[PDB]
């Protein structure tokens, strides 16, 4: 539900939703979008729809289809290196979706911006060390870069307080033109458990396994952990409900 409101944040400032105990129907979400690129690594794209995990992590942001190439473990550009890197250790699906007209309250950020470069200029003479984002890490240059970058190419720098470490955590930002429909990117990072799994598809039983439409037949029953075999019937209530 919180995914369907407000202005979704830019790529380097992706919000997170961690689900450690619930039942998920993903197609009940993807039906609400017009899915465009469903690419998954270390688990099949269909397999991410029905199997139980230990924790399901979902990240969402605004990412145009113009540069779907940058967002994967393949690229060496700035999207996967200074903006958003997802763990290669555990399974990972990546959806690149689109908002439809008939959907409401998904408001439009003015433009898609990303951190082009993030370096540190040492407190010594002129030595430079790039900053490479580890597993999700919010890209430590995120302090200077505002939520959205203003112009085509900008330049944000700060001076770390002396020791630590005298090095200008310099950063730059670059934007891309607006598209008529908000084009979003989602990343699911599921990881299994030792022997406990607590997020599973919501599987509902049908009227075959229903007490009604079976009155008068000898049936097996399993009600809230009490199992046996018998015949159910309709009668006036007794005992405490």
């Amino acid at each position, epitope marked *: 539900s919180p995914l369907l409101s407000g202005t979704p944040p830019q790529v380097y400032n992706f919000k997170r939703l961690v689900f450690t105990n619930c039942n998920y129907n993903l197609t009940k979400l993807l039906s609400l979008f017009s899915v465009n690129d469903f690419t998954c690594s270390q688990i099949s794209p269909a397999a991410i729809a029905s199997n139980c995990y230990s924790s399901l992590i979902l990240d969402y942001f605004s990412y145009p289809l113009s540069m779907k190439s940058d967002l994967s473990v393949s690229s060496a550009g700035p999207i996967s290196q200074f903006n958003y890197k997802q763990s290669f250790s555990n399974p990972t699906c990546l959806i690149l979706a689109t908002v439809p007209h008939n959907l409401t309250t998904i408001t439009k950020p003015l433009k898609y911006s990303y951190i082009n*470069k993030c370096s540190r*200029l040492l407190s010594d003479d*002129r030595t430079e060390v790039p900053q490479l984002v580890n597993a999700n890490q919010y890209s430590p240059c995120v302090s*200077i870069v505002p939520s959205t970058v203003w*112009e085509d190419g900008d330049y944000y720098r700060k001076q770390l307080s002396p020791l630590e470490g005298g090095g200008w955590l310099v950063a730059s930002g670059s934007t891309v033109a607006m598209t008529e429909q908000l084009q979003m990117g989602f990343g699911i990072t599921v990881q299994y458990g030792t022997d406990t799994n607590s997020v599973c598809p919501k599987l509902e039983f049908a009227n075959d396994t229903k007490i009604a439409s079976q009155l008068g037949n000898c049936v097996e029953y399993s009600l809230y952990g009490v199992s046996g075999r018998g015949v159910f019937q309709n009668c006036t209530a007794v005992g405490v409900r």
Partner: antibody
Amino acid sequence: QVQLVQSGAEVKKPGSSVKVSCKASGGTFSSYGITWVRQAPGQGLEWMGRIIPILGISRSVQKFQGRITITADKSTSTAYMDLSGLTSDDTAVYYCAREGGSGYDFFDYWGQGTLVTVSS
Amino acid sequence: EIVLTQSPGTLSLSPGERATLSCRASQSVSSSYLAWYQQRPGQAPRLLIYGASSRATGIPDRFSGSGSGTDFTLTIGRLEPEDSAVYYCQQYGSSPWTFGQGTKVEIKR
């Protein structure tokens, strides 16, 4: 407090190329852009472009786009423009000046200036 | 892109007289995103005011800076003969950063 020392009056021909070289006396291009600023003779300053050798990024005004390349050699710490494809109307004194970042792009210390004179 | 007006231009004022320089903006700019510069006869312009309020490190505080939103005023409380120069108000507020037409101060001794 870094003094900025530039180059010297290129006389070129209408349809040529000028590499104006602004030198960062000190050895130190820190987190500091060089922004270039025209001034036609007896007229008022404009903007032409900006670079950061720390990141190699460059940006140019719309009018001068497709004719100007602003580069810098961070190691030897010396910045240059190269206004290729220039007409006779660009005969002006060109300054190089130190940026400050995003919300503080006021031009602190300036270069002496290098008058390009372009007519055959 | 913001075309901008300046002061009347050439000004004749005796030493010890306050001087006011105007900088109206045709398009709205941020309340504090304009910088007043001074260039001497034959030299490179030196920063006088940044942000339309703060003063450049090592600039005598006769050169007061004020104004917000549309009109920005540079007021020189006292005038010496070493103030004869051209002053430009640059709005680093929009894009591209537009320098002012420029005003010329002539100290009338």
